[PDB]
Design an enzyme around this catalytic site. Structure first.
Site, PDB file in Angstrom:
ATOM      1  N   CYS A 228       0.871  -1.186   0.000  1.00  0.00           N
ATOM      2  CA  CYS A 228       0.000   0.000   0.000  1.00  0.00           C
ATOM      3  C   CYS A 228       0.903   1.229   0.000  1.00  0.00           C
ATOM      4  O   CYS A 228       1.820   1.289  -0.834  1.00  0.00           O
ATOM      5  CB  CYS A 228      -0.878  -0.111   1.252  1.00  0.00           C
ATOM      6  SG  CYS A 228      -2.181   1.081   1.339  1.00  0.00           S
ATOM      7  N   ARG A 233      -2.689  -1.048   5.103  1.00  0.00           N
ATOM      8  CA  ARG A 233      -3.858  -1.680   4.495  1.00  0.00           C
ATOM      9  C   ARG A 233      -3.407  -2.966   3.860  1.00  0.00           C
ATOM     10  O   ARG A 233      -4.212  -3.920   3.647  1.00  0.00           O
ATOM     11  CB  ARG A 233      -4.496  -0.743   3.456  1.00  0.00           C
ATOM     12  CG  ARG A 233      -5.067   0.552   4.079  1.00  0.00           C
ATOM     13  CD  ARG A 233      -5.475   1.592   3.023  1.00  0.00           C
ATOM     14  NE  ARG A 233      -4.309   2.216   2.389  1.00  0.00           N
ATOM     15  CZ  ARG A 233      -4.356   3.002   1.312  1.00  0.00           C
ATOM     16  NH1 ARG A 233      -5.511   3.280   0.721  1.00  0.00           N
ATOM     17  NH2 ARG A 233      -3.231   3.506   0.819  1.00  0.00           N
TER      18      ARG A 233
END
EC number: 2.8.1.1
Length: 272
Positions: A228, A233
């Site tokens: 990410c 994430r």
């Protein structure tokens, strides 16, 4: 495919808040949420001040991690139940740290704080302090971590799952989580992290998740790396790919685009 061993329901959690050798641990950005209220008996890890190296760009090493857990009262033999707000991202990041350092019994609270609050389950503002323990971590298991040189070598060799937003992925927008260039790693596929979660924060079913990655182009003849902007994430997606969907060769690239997009001469690919 390990859903049974890696995830617990809010229902199980509420019934087991004071069960032997089980400890609840709230992980987020800062501890502002936890300090307002928290799951009864839970302790907090601050993702910024507790889990990051304060000087170098890295997270804590095995000794620092051991020292921190000892001080907070977590034992090697405890079952650790991790949960948080900001979509259980930082809880998933902490889950990945725990596995990196060899902790066996650790699980996510499915849906984290969002699901717990949505269920209307009690929260407490009482302070919590646990007796200190002696935690001793193992050396990092780097089979679950990718570093910059291996990521560059993985282009066209491994699945590279970019979990950022489509506009970041195409390079329409660049992004403190900045880099020198917009775009994605060549050959990467974009599965924004949130596609793997329900509205109430819970993980989607194994059926929904397998379809999602298969449709996006996850190649089952290849090993995988997720990324990410910072390891965040992508840790949530790592958990989905390795722990729920059972892929045995999945690494989190924690350097992510903040590193890769700042590297001199790295291959970059635009659009999609």
């Amino acid at each position: 495919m390990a859903r049974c061993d890696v995830l617990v329901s809010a229902d199980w959690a509420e019934s087991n808040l004071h069960a032997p050798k089980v400890v609840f641990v709230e992980v987020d950005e800062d501890t502002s949420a936890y300090d307002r209220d928290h799951i009864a008996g839970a302790i907090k890890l601050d993702w910024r001040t507790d889990l990051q190296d304060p000087v170098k760009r890295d997270f804590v090493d095995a000794q620092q991690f051991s020292k921190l857990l000892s001080e907070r009262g977590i034992a090697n033999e405890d079952t650790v139940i991790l949960y948080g707000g900001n979509n259980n991202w930082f809880a998933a990041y902490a889950y990945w740290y725990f596995k990196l350092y060899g902790h066996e019994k650790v699980k996510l609270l499915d849906g984290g704080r969002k699901k717990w609050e949505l269920d209307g389950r009690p929260l407490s503002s009482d302070p919590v302090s646990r007796p200190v323990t002696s935690y001793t971590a193992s050396p990092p298991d780097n089979t679950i971590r990718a570093f910059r040189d291996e990521v560059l070598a993985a282009i066209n060799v491994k699945n590279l799952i970019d979990v950022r937003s489509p506009d970041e992925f195409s390079g329409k927008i660049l992004a403190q989580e900045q880099s020198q260039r917009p775009g994605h790693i060549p050959g990467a596929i974009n599965v924004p992290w949130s596609r793997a979660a329900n509205e109430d924060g819970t993980f989607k079913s194994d059926e929904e998740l397998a379809k999602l990655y298969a449709d996006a182009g996850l190649d089952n003849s290849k090993e995988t790396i997720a990324y990410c902007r910072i390891g965040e994430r992508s840790s949530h997606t790592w958990f989905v790919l390795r722990e729920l969907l059972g892929h045995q060769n999945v690494k989190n690239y924690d350097g992510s685009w903040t590193e890769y997009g700042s590297l001199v001469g790295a291959p970059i690919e635009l659009g999609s």
